[PDB]
Design a protein around this nucleic acid. Structure first.
Ligand SMILES: Nc1ncnc2c1ncn2[C@@H]1O[C@H](C[C@@H](N)CC[C@H](N)C(=O)O)[C@@H](O)[C@H]1O
Length: 249
DNA sequence: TTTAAAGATCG
DNA sequence: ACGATCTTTAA
């Protein structure tokens, strides 16, 4: 199991065992919601089409890919004991929000993810990163995880776009895995949740396999009805489970 | 400017 | 999810 170098919501690490099982084989893998890219890191496809709506996330992935050795050295400088305090953190957070340089923003982004509160990625409406100090004992610098990502990203394309646009890149040789934001138990709207199901069925009609992972609620079944629904008993956090929607042509 | 509800902010 | 504090929205 390969861990991503970023703390990210919906890591789906324990689900990797169940995903790979129900994930069809093909040449290309398309992920409209790549996020940390845990699925991308723990699979083996010829090509990858990875996309996310987060511009800072996508920009980082291209910096790490193209300028690996340069980035790792510059980013290792921030993971020192002297940077593990509030005063330094908020200045680095400020420098990030004011920087125009993609490289410098990419370097600080890893710092803010590892030193920030719970590894959250929160912005205001100004597009400014506003996550407070995390106050950890000793933040880990994922040097091994970075090099593993870079060597694997060589067979991948990164795009900053919505799910609708990225799924349009899918073809015969491509297999699609969708990991949308979690469905409400009781921002990603419900219309976008249902719209994802519409495209998935339009793709499987064009002989293109699509796998979707989400929570197990009454709404998820009503959207994913046309797929072979498999369930995994996580039963954690009322006890809710995770639902797998597979569209096999 | 008034007003009351709602959204946004950020530790 | 929390919450004290601004900002927003429209008659
Ligand atoms: N409309 C959207 N289109 C494409 N991506 C989106 C959209 N909305 C949110 N996202 C991204 O989808 C991701 C949701 C995450 N749960 C994905 C987790 C991902 N599977 C991982 O291993 O980390 C986030 O990175 C979002 O930035």
């Amino acid at each position: 199991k390969n861990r991503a170098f970023l703390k990210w919501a919906g890591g789906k690490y324990p689900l990797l065992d169940d995903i790979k099982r129900h994930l069809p084989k093909g040449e290309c893998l398309v992920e409209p919601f790549v996020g940390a890219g845990s699925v991308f890191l723990n699979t083996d496809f010829s090509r990858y089409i990875l996309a996310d709506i987060n511009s800072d996330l996508i920009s980082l992935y291209n910096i790490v890919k193209m300028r690996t050795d340069e980035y790792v050295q510059a980013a290792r400088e921030l993971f020192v004991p002297e940077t593990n305090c509030a005063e330094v953190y908020y200045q680095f957070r400020e420098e990030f929000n004011k920087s125009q340089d993609p490289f410098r923003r990419a370097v600080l982004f890893l710092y803010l993810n590892r030193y920030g509160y719970n590894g959250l990625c929160r912005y205001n409406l100004r597009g400014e990163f506003n996550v407070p100090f995390g106050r950890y004992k000793k933040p880990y610098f994922p040097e091994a995880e970075l090099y593993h990502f870079a060597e694997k990203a060589q067979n991948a394309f990164f795009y900053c776009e919505s799910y609708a646009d990225s799924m349009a890149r899918a073809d015969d040789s491509s297999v699609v895995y969708c990991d949308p934001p979690y469905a409400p138990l009781s921002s990603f709207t419900l219309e976008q949740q249902a719209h994802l199901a519409e495209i998935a069925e339009g793709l499987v009609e064009r002989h293109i396999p699509v796998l979707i992972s989400n929570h197990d609620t009454m709404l998820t079944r009503e959207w994913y009805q046309r797929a072979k629904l498999h369930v995994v008993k996580v039963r954690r956090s009322k006890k809710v489970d995770e639902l797998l929607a597979l569209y096999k042509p």
